[PDB]
Amino acid sequence: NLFVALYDFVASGDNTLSITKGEKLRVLGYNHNGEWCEAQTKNGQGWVPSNYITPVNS
């Protein structure tokens, strides 16, 4: 489940994680309605918006 960041997102509390466009990440899980995604990048782990990432592989 490899994904890549579509846009920049800066963390602002609630255990969110800052990501830069083009950055690869492993998705660990989602919240109840899939709006938030728990991710791991080389910089750490935390929540990022699901609409800010896209799958890699096809």
């Binding site: 919240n31 709006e35 699901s50």
Partner: peptide, 10 residues
Amino acid sequence: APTMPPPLPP
């Protein structure tokens, strides 16, 4: 998970 809603794509 966050209690705040996610921002919209730019």
